Amino acid sequence: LGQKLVIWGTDVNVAACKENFQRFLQRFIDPLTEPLYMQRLGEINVIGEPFLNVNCEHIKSFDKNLYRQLISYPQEVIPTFDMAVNEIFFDRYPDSILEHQIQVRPFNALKTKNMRNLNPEDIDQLITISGMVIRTSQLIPEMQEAFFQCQVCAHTTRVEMDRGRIAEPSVCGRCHTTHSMALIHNRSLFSDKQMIKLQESPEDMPAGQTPHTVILFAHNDLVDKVQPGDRVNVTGIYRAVPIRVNPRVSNVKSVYKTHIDVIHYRKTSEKRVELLKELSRKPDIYERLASALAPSIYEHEDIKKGILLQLFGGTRKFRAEINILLCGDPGTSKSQLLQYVYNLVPRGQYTSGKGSSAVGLTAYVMKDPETRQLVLQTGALVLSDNGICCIDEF
Amino acid sequence: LKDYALEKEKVKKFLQEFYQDDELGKKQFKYGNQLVRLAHREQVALYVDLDDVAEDDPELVDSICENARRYAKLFADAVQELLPQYKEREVVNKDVLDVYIEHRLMMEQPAELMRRFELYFQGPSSNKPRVIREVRADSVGKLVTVRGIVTRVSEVKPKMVVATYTCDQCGAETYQPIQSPTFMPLIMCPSQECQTNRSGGRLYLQTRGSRFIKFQEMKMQEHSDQVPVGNIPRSITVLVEGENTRIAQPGDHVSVTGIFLPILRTGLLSETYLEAHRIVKMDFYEKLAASIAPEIYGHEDVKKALLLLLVGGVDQSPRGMKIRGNINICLMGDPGVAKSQLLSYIDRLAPRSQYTTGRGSSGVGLTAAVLRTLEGGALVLADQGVCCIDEFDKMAEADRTAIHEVMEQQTISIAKAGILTTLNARCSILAAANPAYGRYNPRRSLEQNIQLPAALLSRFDLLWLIQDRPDRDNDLRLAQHITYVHQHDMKLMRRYIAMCREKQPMVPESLADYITAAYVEMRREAWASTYTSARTLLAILRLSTALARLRMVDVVEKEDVNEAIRLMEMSKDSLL
DNA sequence: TTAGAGAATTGGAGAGTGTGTTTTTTTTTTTT
DNA sequence: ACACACTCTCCAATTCTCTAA
Ligand SMILES: [Zn+2]
């Protein structure tokens, strides 16, 4: 009887908690018409995505008690909210078909903690932090349900597995012969995981110091959504784990290693055609489009026209595209002009003829810093195929 | 050996009865008051002072100084036994870990799990600090005091103190206190019901119940002047734990009280470390212009240029069309000229600054570097301040590109392990350079004399040639001063620049029109007499706004533009 | 007809034994 | 000091056989 369940180490009732979340779904209209998340529930029923975002500020403004319980015990509360959503989703629209149970992703709008101020008091609480991505691993497969088959008589059995431990059979129940059951790797059931590395952003640093870093693990749906160098806000569970002294021995060290278990992260038409047709039918459109380029430059109109013509180009034997050269004194605005036009075209590239440049004009082969296997690095000229390549100090 | 029960009662007597003639002689019994605060969970750590103990029992102090670890445990138990007597109040529930303890009490109705306080010794004033070389093996286990410089510090990590497990079958709980640097966890339930029935229930560890403490690792090194002739300096590892964390910083002088102990294995020779118990760290315009480098005769307006370099302009920041406020200047010196004195005076004067030389010496470079974490770099260590480069003309292409990147973006990049890490460099730059051969030649341009490339060399707001030559009276005056020196308020200045730099003065359209007329006339003369460009206009803006900041005024005025104009104009005269 | 006691065979719970475990000097080709 | 692989032992569970309830 579900009403008897209470979370360990504390005194919170599970069934009451589920009911309170359902009341929130059935009541929270947008304070700025059915409830806001009920709109998304109606939409996701037809769109077919497997997840539902909820903003924590709506939970807090609806009820302080539920909010406190969520932040305190995310490991037990979040699966309860998952169950609540799925009950409503299938109580309504029962004929709809969906391959998976819906996930709920609570998220907090803004950073609550500096990654320099995380303390032992925070362990297993829901926190949110911000930073700059540095590196992303290859995708890692992960076991979910082991498949065992008897060597002697081909009988099969399946084992649901327990926080990383497999309950290996000792004897085949059909043929009563010990140590005869074998794990079949490619018949087992697997999941996806990825490891991401993140750094504090340069603005919030103490003066003259080097930056700190953390390790994030992302599962299933979220497993490939970010790339190096960009910046994000992340919400997750702050975990802590022991580590072994050597691969053979079973002793563990007395100082633990911590990581973030990711739950949510955020990055920081006929009407147009008719407008374009009317604008193109306007007189002196060539002058107007040229004039639109680089407003910081007040007089070089025919140069702007030449650049505009390069952006438009010919059409397809013979080379159909256009090449342009700018010459004169250093310190003139030409580099700014290159950087301006570089930012206007999707397949654009920018580099310098100097050896200090960030990416070379020449293709080359090197060893991967991760695997130390060979990788072919094509140059800027190749990457800008069917695009514009800006070159400085030519 | 002593009876530690008698010693416990003596310690209790000290805590119960000692008063330092405390609270302005009102005799309020400092440690009794502290025990009240501890009982009501107002405070965590308690620093017992051994000078107080010495008033009653110096033999106890001597007993503590050797084999300190016993007395650490003894005092902690005494405080735990006395704590309920100073309680009078019920404390509010405020911690998940204590919610588990509260549930444990509710279900029940070891002490290490409940003992939420820390106890540390403050060293007796008799004990002078040792150098890291004088802590020899006869001091193992004894209380010591050491002095040195910090080199490296880790982040704060959670250290395990007692583990808590739960049993799947019988519903009980078990505890395991931790003391060594490693341990081995439990597996299967030892309770009598599970054991007698051999039911095989397994144990699951609970991070919601177990106890953790803040832990941090640090290294400390000898002062260079304390090292004996012809030797390499040594270092010592210091372990910081509890309420002592986050005090120390890299490159900072500290004095540490602690216990010196050997490391546990997993030969008879073993490494050692220092267990920390306490860490202890070791008009206006003309007047301020005349206050810069008074040892040096002449160079009146150069001193004002350096003053405005320290004061700075304003970052305009119009919606990304950025103009930066940092002044940057360069000094060209004849061989052996007085510039070294002026440079070192500004280096000494400035509240946050750094120095380096362009030859690329055996030490760390202008940018950050890697060792086996990232560290260092003159461009990095000067951040909210000014950085000075000496013998700039001997720089390499790496140095030139680094300076170019700082001038554009005021940030740098160094690869730790192929990753593209990047790092703040927000400071202003001051450059000192010398001609390629001999004295500067007025018959040739400055590019021909100093021979840096014109692209970066023209970045500086001001350029000054420091040329000087013999004369009988001036040389005699200088010689008299030097021989006199050999024979025999900065706080106000810092406060003035602190308060005045709060201003960000704007310009009205009338001043913009005035500047337009002045600038076009100046450029007409420049081509008629070329070097003038947009950089010149931004330099005028920077120096005039900087002067407006030097005044306690919210806007620039005509006199500021005129002052900036005569300063940039007259700088050419130094080249001739 | 249903159930317990005395004798013989066999499984496995348990113990014991053996073994494994960045940072400096010098050459060679080709770039300058 | 702390884990595999192998060898070996003694205790008592399972069945046969004779007997009483
Ligand atoms: Zn089988």
Ligand SMILES: [Zn+2]
């Ligand atoms: Zn048990």
